[PDB]
């Protein structure tokens, strides 16, 4: 967030050989950048990705969001696509630990 981006930035601008850039400069550079709008183009797309983000993640084949523990002989559910399985599209009623 710091350097990383800045570095690439200047490089593509050609003109200067980074390195000899006082550290007070590169960061200060960010401080100014992080205060502007964003080419509708650019922006307009990110808004898009975020809205669908969730949907992709769970929609994948390898990987799912967390598991629950009941220590309560629990009844397995049935869903056409998987057969006799133990899913549950809704965690509500048990603490959540990020």
């Amino acid at each position: 967030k710091m350097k990383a981006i800045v570095e690439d930035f200047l490089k593509r601008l050609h003109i200067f050989d980074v390195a000899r850039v006082p550290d007070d400069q590169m960061y200060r550079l960010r401080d100014r950048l992080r205060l502007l709008p964003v080419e509708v183009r650019r922006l307009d797309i990110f808004n898009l990705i975020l809205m669908n983000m969730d949907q992709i993640e769970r929609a994948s084949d390898k990987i799912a969001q967390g598991v629950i523990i009941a220590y309560r002989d629990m009844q397995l559910e049935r869903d056409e696509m998987y057969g006799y399985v133990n899913i549950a599209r809704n965690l509500d009623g048990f603490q959540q630990i990020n």
Partner: protein
């Protein structure tokens, strides 16, 4: 609560800024906000109603977002949207109404309904925005602690009161002296009468006074003050104070002498006007005091002299009066006035659904009763209920 607000300006600034055509970019900042909502919702079930003739409609959520793709909206885009809004409309209505009836003596200022108690929840606050609607603007500042303030017109500060006080009377009621008045809404009319036309009064002048104590302070009031009380300028047959008989009032009007209006705040004179009729400003007051006199005319043409004999019977009753009207004012507390529909909205929803009388509000939301005993609980409930009515009127009128 603040939650609730958004839900609307959301829809209005929505059902309004979305029409077959408009170039997208007028809503980019809008579409977004919208979606955000849908998400937070979907998956949570809701319940409303459960009293009088208020249906118990149940609700559920599971809706697709809104393609933020296109550059110019095509009709097809609208319809697939309006159909999703019309569930929120018909919803909110059933939501407002539900919390627009329940009342609480203790914390009658906070949320009550099983619908709202769940809204103040934290996972929901991810919505608030554009609080420019005069009422919410004031709700916040109050929850935060500061000088609130609302704008009115012909405000409704005076509980209805129409009566008289006989300072001199006798069984025959043939030589009375006193005052009669009508305080109602934003107006006061008061007349001072002296059947004897101050014949035996010191300096041939009879002093009168009318004091009205407001239940709430009014600030920045624009007021019309005029001489004479037309309402008490005609012949009347009135019931006696004890209700046992009736007296006759046959007024003849003279100009009120030494008129002095004082607008007091906690006993202190804030504004005082001496015989100034027309438009006057009273900047901060909780009491109005009108003092005026009847002065027997020192010089009288025969026709006048004939009305005022040295001895009874007194057949023409000398009367002086004043009329005062508060055109506009600001109050830190919500009040009914001549322009806002809040009181009428709340009263109407309760009447339509046969809502039972509760522990806070007088039967029928009666204004006179309410303002006469305007307790803190009634005010907090009234403000909550008025703010909800205003949120509702942004979409449903």
């Amino acid at each position: 609560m603040d939650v609730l607000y958004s839900l609307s300006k959301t829809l209005k600034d929505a059902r309004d800024k979305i029409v077959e055509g408009t170039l997208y970019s007028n809503v980019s900042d809008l579409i977004q906000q919208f979606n955000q909502m849908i998400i937070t919702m979907n998956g949570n079930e809701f319940q409303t109603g459960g009293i009088g003739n208020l249906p118990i409609r149940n609700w559920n959520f599971d809706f697709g977002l809104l393609g933020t793709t296109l550059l110019n909206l095509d009709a097809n885009y609208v319809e697939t949207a309006r159909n999703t809004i019309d569930y929120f409309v018909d919803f909110v209505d059933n939501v407002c109404m539900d919390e627009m009836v329940r009342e609480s003596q203790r914390n009658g200022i906070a949320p009550q309904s099983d619908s709202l108690r769940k809204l103040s929840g934290l996972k929901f606050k991810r919505i608030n925005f554009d609080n420019s609607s005069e009422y919410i603007e004031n709700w916040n500042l109050q929850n935060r602690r500061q000088r609130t303030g609302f704008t009115f017109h012909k405000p409704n500060i005076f509980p209805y009161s129409a009566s008289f006080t006989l300072n001199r009377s006798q069984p025959a009621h043939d030589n009375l002296m006193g005052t009669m008045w009508l305080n109602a809404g934003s107006e006061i009319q008061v007349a001072g009468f002296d059947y004897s036309c101050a014949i035996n009064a010191p300096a041939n002048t009879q002093q009168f006074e009318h004091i009205v104590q407001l239940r709430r302070v009014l600030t920045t009031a624009t007021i019309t003050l005029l001489p004479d009380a037309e309402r008490f300028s005609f012949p009347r047959v009135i019931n006696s104070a004890d209700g046992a008989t009736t007296w006759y009032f046959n007024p003849v009007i003279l100009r009120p002498n030494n008129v002095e209006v004082e607008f007091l705040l906690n006993g202190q004179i804030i504004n005082t006007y001496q015989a100034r009729f027309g438009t006057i400003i009273a900047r901060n007051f909780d009491t109005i005091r009108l003092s005026f006199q009847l002065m027997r005319p020192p010089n009288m043409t025969p026709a006048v002299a004939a009305l005022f004999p040295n001895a009874q019977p007194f057949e023409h009753h000398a009367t002086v009066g004043l009329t005062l009207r508060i055109e506009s004012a600001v109050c830190e507390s919500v009040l009914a006035d001549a322009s806002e529909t809040m009181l009428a909205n709340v009263t109407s929803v309760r009447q339509e659904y046969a809502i039972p009388v509760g522990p806070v509000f007088p039967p029928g939301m009666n204004w006179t009763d309410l303002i006469t005993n305007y307790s803190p609980s009634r005010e907090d409930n009234l403000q909550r209920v008025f703010t909800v009515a205003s949120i509702r009127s942004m979409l449903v009128k």
